[PDB]
Ligand binder design. Structure first.
Ligand SMILES: *[C@@H]1O[C@H](CO)[C@@H](O[C@@H]2O[C@H](CO)[C@@H](O[C@@H]3O[C@H](CO)[C@@H](O)[C@H](O[C@H]4O[C@H](CO)[C@@H](O)[C@H](O)[C@@H]4O)[C@@H]3O)[C@H](O)[C@H]2NC(C)=O)[C@H](O)[C@H]1NC(C)=O
Ligand SMILES: *[C@@H]1O[C@H](CO)[C@@H](O[C@@H]2O[C@H](CO)[C@@H](O[C@@H]3O[C@H](CO)[C@@H](O)[C@H](O[C@H]4O[C@H](CO)[C@@H](O)[C@H](O)[C@@H]4O)[C@@H]3O)[C@H](O)[C@H]2NC(C)=O)[C@H](O)[C@H]1NC(C)=O
Ligand SMILES: *[C@@H]1O[C@H](CO)[C@@H](O[C@@H]2O[C@H](CO)[C@@H](O[C@@H]3O[C@H](CO)[C@@H](O)[C@H](O)[C@@H]3O)[C@H](O)[C@H]2NC(C)=O)[C@H](O)[C@H]1NC(C)=O
Ligand SMILES: *[C@@H]1O[C@H](CO)[C@@H](O[C@@H]2O[C@H](CO)[C@@H](O[C@@H]3O[C@H](CO)[C@@H](O)[C@H](O)[C@@H]3O)[C@H](O)[C@H]2NC(C)=O)[C@H](O)[C@H]1NC(C)=O
Ligand SMILES: *[C@@H]1O[C@H](CO)[C@@H](O[C@@H]2O[C@H](CO)[C@@H](O)[C@H](O)[C@H]2NC(C)=O)[C@H](O)[C@H]1NC(C)=O
Ligand SMILES: *[C@@H]1O[C@H](CO)[C@@H](O[C@@H]2O[C@H](CO)[C@@H](O)[C@H](O)[C@H]2NC(C)=O)[C@H](O)[C@H]1NC(C)=O
Ligand SMILES: *[C@@H]1O[C@H](CO)[C@@H](O[C@@H]2O[C@H](CO)[C@@H](O)[C@H](O)[C@H]2NC(C)=O)[C@H](O)[C@H]1NC(C)=O
Ligand SMILES: *[C@@H]1O[C@H](CO)[C@@H](O[C@@H]2O[C@H](CO)[C@@H](O)[C@H](O)[C@H]2NC(C)=O)[C@H](O)[C@H]1NC(C)=O
Ligand code: EEW
Ligand code: EEW
Ligand code: EEW
Ligand code: EEW
Ligand code: NAG
Ligand code: NAG
Ligand code: NAG
Ligand code: NAG
Ligand code: CA
Ligand code: CA
Ligand code: CA
Ligand code: CA
Ligand code: CA
Ligand code: CA
Ligand code: CA
Ligand code: CA
Lengths: 387, 387, 387, 387
């Protein structure tokens, strides 16, 4: 058992090979599958797991009623092996949580689960399943975190939390954590920026996070930092806008793009020099479809030209959240940190006539060998018996 | 593999961070979840488990009928990982039992399961799943035990059993067990005291148990003892009365408080010098709500002043049994024994219009970092289909 | 990993402590539990398992129809941890079989599964899940075996198979097996004897089997032998008759007792010198109830006096097959081979108005500490929804 | 952990002993069992697993509708232990796939899963669950592979893929793979031959594959090759025609037998010098029955004489695909590579009046001890509730 180094660069990639699909909603029409949202993937040196926030209910049961609701005392962070359906019969219990993160440092799992009231929520940190720290709301307004993996470098792991308005200026903090204990934190000095639900990854010993501006940006904000929490901030400049909703692609901005900027969806992007791999919905206005775009000057350049598009989910199918996950050389035997991603395929409310809201998932890993675009949607037939 | 020392002191704590929630009843509306009551938590050096007394039936099935009944030949002691629902598909079989205790000495699990007739019940002791001892009823009147974890120090584990009336003077014995063999027992000389369902924990090489007086006390009795079974006895003095039912808080007594003293609920408290952390229901008359109170002179003082109250379950929600569990330094890496606790959330009979009685659980661990009060109730919608 | 020695004596025992109960039929009213019969228990140096013959169907499903039928191409030998319900989600696949045995030699599991047609059935032997040998029917008339554990001594394991009439003289062979290969066999020269479904155990390096005479005996036949297959044969002499059906107890015989001698039930007994522990039904005529009787001269003496009776299942409850299993000193750390037993609690046809037949189980281990009689019956409420 | 040698010869065998039966369809009438087709078996040095292509749905649920369809984005390659039903609660996720192969080199599992559109499908190769390579369609017409195990020799594993028409000349390639990376491939020069769904096994350091001609052959084509991919090609000469459909047995051909040659079923055969063990359906026109035939000159001789026939599934019962699998000396301790085989028992469409298509399985291993013919069919009663 050895700590992940995290000092190699992100592997450069030409396209995305399909890695998993769980078919959760299809299966849960009969089987005992949790109602879940906010799923994400994270890997140890030996395996990759799907983490998710349950609603303490199963699909096609009456207790799935009203699961559009985000925060309750019933929600729990749990995990299962990647590509398996999240069931009570195969899921590890992690934490009581309505917002979460998790990541493996090479030795043990760090889990962060936030529960409690909106006006004083508390993040519970566990290392190897034992409580190691807590941190309470500092603005008394829905303390919340990534909904995807934290990122680890040489025994220290890193995340971002937000507290404050989801429709205005809020407060954003970066944390360094070692063996589940917070050792350092800093508040980002980011007036006029908005950060939610960061997708953070390690690359050459430093952390890069691509987040969601829910206030006034249809491009994605980013924050990057070293192990000392010395940070930089910006927005992705590309006119290939990354949030949902958004406008049609046009000349972008290196600050927040106000057009269609309110509200958003969790997402991710991978930075390679001045270029970027952008994952986004296909629809500008709704959580439909998914695609990967390689824009070789899109981190810093404002044009709407790009070089590669790969289809992931068709424009007439439901998509949802997405996030980064990485596979370190300790797991793969490669000489670089492999980028992967997942997509949550959200079914039910508000778009469909059900009593419930739940998701399934798909995931892909970056390669330099041949790939293909297609559509790998959820596939369940709604409504269900319970509806 | 090394025996737990049990020689450090209980960690002082300022509040309780949420540790687990299983949502058993909500899930069992559809999933295959045991009807259970008398759950408890206990940990090895490697993991924490939920133990429970099944009724040999599943939720929402006809065999759940009449499960208000306490003792039958179908009841079994089983266990699963903490925070997972108790199912036939994830639960380990421990013993045939309608009353139980269990605890890990650092090397193997000790389980104690009592079955047989009311007039001659027998406790079957297992160490690593192999029968190692038995002990038969000595008063021929429902031999019974903790319904929570036993306590271990340097290779010896300790428990309390009762035999006799539940509504008058009974007989109470303390046992020392090594590798699942009873090596010593003493009968407590406690005229006018009543002991049921003890919550026992180790602290500085000695055992403290806080129990239920079902005869004539609305405060909780205690017994504490060393490894040689040299004991002391008393009642918690605080006017913050700990049992349910009880009177409104007023001046307490260091002997049994007769007002509303008959009947009771299993509970716990943690002694720190002259102070006590009291877990109790919020209602004085019914098993509703739950709260933690820090009363810095409440072990020996009779006033009803306290310093800290932390809400756990709201006053309008069902609660039930509660108990201590500990995490030893061998599990945590700390230099003290960490106090935790669980609460059983009882659903169904007698208070609700069902054919069945079952519970879910929540648990918390003591910390000195920030925490918050809230309500984490059961959340199932009764009655069920079967009712 | 070391071979079981099997050279110590059977531990002497004063009574029987309850060890497991699975509640299979009760649970299977809702859960996904196999229709099974012919269950048995067997242990390795690390764990004990329940083996059983499925009918390739679940309880409360239409495919449970007609499971009174003994032999089909759907029946499989499977196993699960002792006291858990036999489900597709927790059961290991062992062999395709409508008659079986299994036992652990200290290194790996031997399983013997007989399938094929009545006129040419083939026993498939597996060691560690790999086919190691076969043996085909030699009388072309339902080759069949123990339905309980084989017995192992110093790397060799032993069983008995029968081929021929179940209502007349048949042929009975003893086998020595090493690493799943038959190394020696002998045909028992037993004119006028009938052997079915032997319960065999090791004791002081030699094997003792107590079996079922289905032709003309209401006492039980026995065969004993050393590792070279040098055997002796007899019947239990006690007037405490061991088979079901049987007459009322009276003066017995050291040969087959013809009164009520046709038909029978699988059972067991443990020999201690001239004495015997007899497990039997409570009813003389039907598979109802169960009890343990210690008769200190019953192996060789024909009187109907006995010293100890312990109740196991009440006379108004359904019982069924029973069998021996042992726990070797390699598992327990004792200096003797511990006797245990199981009882199959058969529900459904022919006695009850269902489409199906299935069982649950209970088990006990012998001790010298205090025990108690009670009734631990199946407890399911028949008929079921499917009926 | 050591690479399989693969250098011993195939064990000569006189008959087939039954190894497994899962009863998947019978069980899935109630239990949570995947709709599957294209199952196969493959073994490591420690265990044997059943691999299968799920339809992302469970039996007796509405999402099983339309599962006659071969390729969709919901199909996944998963695996479970041999003889267990494929459930979400016991199955390991392997790959997103509508055509597959897998095999263990002695160190880790290689899985090959093909997904994407018909005009540009991509095979994703994983080694120990990590993507290690991809290969894209080279004829843009349903890139596809074995549906049974690949074959490994001294750290290299070997498979065959096809791209092009299923009813005319297509393109066939052989691949050598090391640690999940393609290191060599060659296109077979096989004008007028047709290769689909190869069953490939190792024998004396070389690979023999027996496949399906779906274009114009009712005998089976074969390809054999060394580690350098130097190959030979032919058709099985025996007048005991191996495909389904086929004509009645008559004089065969060493090239494709045109009579009833169009269409086909996946199958296998084992070469021993000039002789062959042929597994085939009993019906010439439909997927019914199964039998093993030993034809001692059938690899190169055109007569329809044979020496041994062993029944496996009766002529009036449904069969389906079949394939080889092997057990290497590293698993068995033998001095030769043991041949086994599986049979898929297909239920539902097109032959039966259901909304769905799924299968169960049986498997057998070759021995030289006594065996017997019988019928071990699927046994489910169709239609189901959902139909
Ligand atoms: C859970 O357990 C409860 C309690 O047993 C059970 O409710 C009971 O159901 C039974 C059957 O419906 C009821 O018993 C009947 O009561 C009526 C009077 O209300 C009697 O007339 C009936 O007797 C007649 O019918 C019998 C059968 O034909 C004859 O044997 C008899 O001589 C009479 O002709 C019968 O006793 C009982 O009233 C209820 N009790 C309640 C609701 O309190 C409940 O159904 C169980 N639920 C499940 C899911 O298992
Ligand atoms: C499995 O899949 C099959 C195939 O889809 C499915 O069977 C089909 O069910 C549908 C719904 O019952 C049927 O479609 C209907 O067909 C009738 C004629 O027979 C039409 O009149 C119907 O159209 C009217 O109703 C619609 C809804 O109100 C309107 O949109 C429409 O304009 C019309 O007013 C409708 O098309 C179809 O006939 C069957 N096909 C069969 C049986 O072959 C089956 O139910 C599925 N089963 C499960 C369990 O999923
Ligand atoms: C990865 O993290 C490890 C921590 O496990 C880093 O190693 C540590 O580096 C620090 C800073 O130089 C060392 O601190 C030193 O402490 C000693 C006394 O204990 C003092 O004499 C020195 O002046 C200094 O302050 C620490 O010893 C060292 N520990 C170990 C176990 O190596 C490591 O440098 C990090 N690697 C990278 C590439 O960032
Ligand atoms: C338990 O079984 C073991 C087998 O693993 C027994 O040990 C074996 O005993 C036999 C018989 O005496 C020995 O056979 C000898 O073979 C050698 C040549 O290999 C020959 O020179 C001798 O004349 C004799 O025939 C065998 O060596 C021996 N093997 C081992 C590994 O010990 C053991 O005796 C059994 N124990 C009991 C208590 O029954
Ligand atoms: C990335 O981190 C690794 C692991 O610490 C570094 O490799 C070690 O470097 C030191 C000093 O050169 C050696 O003593 C160790 O033996 C190396 N370990 C291994 C496993 O190779 C490596 O230098 C770093 N890579 C960079 C900066 O590119
Ligand atoms: C608690 O028990 C521990 C463990 O036995 C004691 O530590 C051991 O005691 C002596 C030192 O006094 C040494 O021989 C051992 O090496 C110690 N073991 C370890 C693991 O440190 C310890 O002294 C006791 N604690 C207190 C507070 O008295
Ligand atoms: C039962 O078998 C055991 C295990 O083989 C015997 O114990 C061994 O005996 C030999 C010869 O005396 C010693 O060399 C070994 O060291 C012993 N092993 C152990 C683990 O003690 C034992 O003698 C036999 N018991 C009898 C006959 O009562
Ligand atoms: C099959 O391969 C095995 C394993 O590599 C060969 O055995 C090895 O080869 C030589 C002996 O000729 C030794 O260097 C190794 O120690 C052998 N290993 C083992 C485990 O025995 C073997 O020669 C080959 N078999 C045949 C039939 O050619
Ligand atoms: C803007 C980010 C936060 C602010 C509280 O809100 C999130 C949005 C979503 P969304 O998918 O956009 O809602 C439809 C669902 C998430 N659980 C919710 N986070 C929590 C903690 O409530
Ligand atoms: C007072 C202590 C004992 C005396 C026998 O009784 C207990 C009380 C309850 P309670 O939750 O208070 O009942 C509603 C449930 C328990 N299983 C029951 N223990 C057994 C062994 O029967
Ligand atoms: C006499 C022993 C044999 C002769 C074939 O028969 C057994 C009897 C019973 P029983 O419980 O008595 O039937 C109600 C069920 C068993 N499976 C059956 N063994 C097989 C292989 O068929
Ligand atoms: C001829 C070989 C291929 C050509 C595409 O077709 C296969 C045939 C069948 P079959 O069982 O014969 O259909 C009833 C089921 C298979 N999944 C299907 N392979 C895929 C990849 O589609
Ligand atoms: C869903 O919840 C609402 C609010 O409690 C309730 O009134 C309604 O009946 C529920 N609907 C279903 C279908 O369960
Ligand atoms: C702990 O137990 C051992 C017996 O194994 C004994 O020797 C030792 O003195 C005990 N230690 C303490 C601190 O009581
Ligand atoms: C049971 O099986 C018989 C014989 O096939 C059949 O005719 C009958 O309808 C079945 N009954 C039920 C309740 O499934
Ligand atoms: C097996 O592979 C190794 C490469 O690791 C090679 O050195 C060796 O010569 C090969 N052995 C045979 C028998 O082909
Ligand atoms: Ca936005
Ligand atoms: Ca650009
Ligand atoms: Ca009281
Ligand atoms: Ca006070
Ligand atoms: Ca008889
Ligand atoms: Ca006698
Ligand atoms: Ca053909
Ligand atoms: Ca021939």
């Amino acid at each position: 058992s050895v700590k992940l180094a995290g000092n190699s660069s992100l592997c450069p990639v030409s396209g995305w090979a399909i890695y998993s699909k769980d078919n959760s909603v299809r299966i849960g029409s009969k089987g005992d599958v949790f109602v879940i949202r906010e799923p994400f993937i994270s890997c140890s040196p030996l395996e990759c797991r799907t983490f998710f926030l349950t609603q303490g209910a199963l699909l096609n049961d009456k207790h799935s009623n009203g699961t559009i609701k985000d925060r309750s005392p019933y929600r729990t962070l749990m995990s299962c092996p990647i590509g398996e359906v999240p069931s009570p019969y195969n899921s590890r219990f992690e934490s009581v949580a309505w917002s979460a993160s998790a990541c493996h440092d090479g030795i043990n799992w760090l889990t962060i689960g936030i529960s409690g009231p909106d006006n004083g929520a508390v993040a519970v940190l566990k290392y190897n399943g034992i409580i190691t720290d807590t941190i309470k709301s500092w603005r008394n307004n829905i303390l919340r975190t990534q909904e995807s993996e934290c990122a680890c470098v040489n025994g220290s792991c890193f995340t971002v939390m937000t507290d404050g308005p989801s429709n205005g200026q809020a407060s954003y903090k970066i944390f360094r954590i070692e063996k589940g204990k917070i050792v350092k934190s800093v508040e980002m000095n980011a007036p006029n920026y908005h950060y939610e639900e960061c997708s953070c990854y390690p690359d050459s010993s430093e952390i890069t996070c691509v987040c969601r501006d829910n206030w006034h940006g249809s491009n994605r904000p980013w924050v990057s930092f070293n192990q000392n929490l010395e940070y930089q901030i910006g927005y992705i400049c590309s006119g290939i806008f990354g949030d949902n909703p958004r406008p049609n692609d046009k000349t972008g901005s290196c600050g927040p793009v106000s057009s269609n900027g309110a509200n958003g969806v969790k997402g991710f992007s991978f930075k390679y020099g001045n270029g970027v791999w952008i994952g986004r919905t296909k629809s500008i206005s709704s959580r439909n479809g998914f695609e990967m775009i390689w824009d070789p000057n899109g981190w810093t350049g404002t044009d709407n030209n790009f070089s590669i598009k790969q289809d992931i989910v068709g424009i007439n199918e439901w998509s949802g959240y997405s996030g980064s996950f990485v596979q370190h050389p300790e797991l793969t035997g490669l000489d670089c940190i492999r980028p992967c991603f997942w997509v949550e395929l959200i079914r039910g409310r508000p778009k469909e006539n059900t009593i419930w809201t739940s998701g399934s998932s798909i995931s892909f890993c970056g390669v330099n060998s041949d790939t293909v675009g297609w559509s790998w949607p959820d596939g369940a037939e709604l409504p269900f018996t319970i509806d």
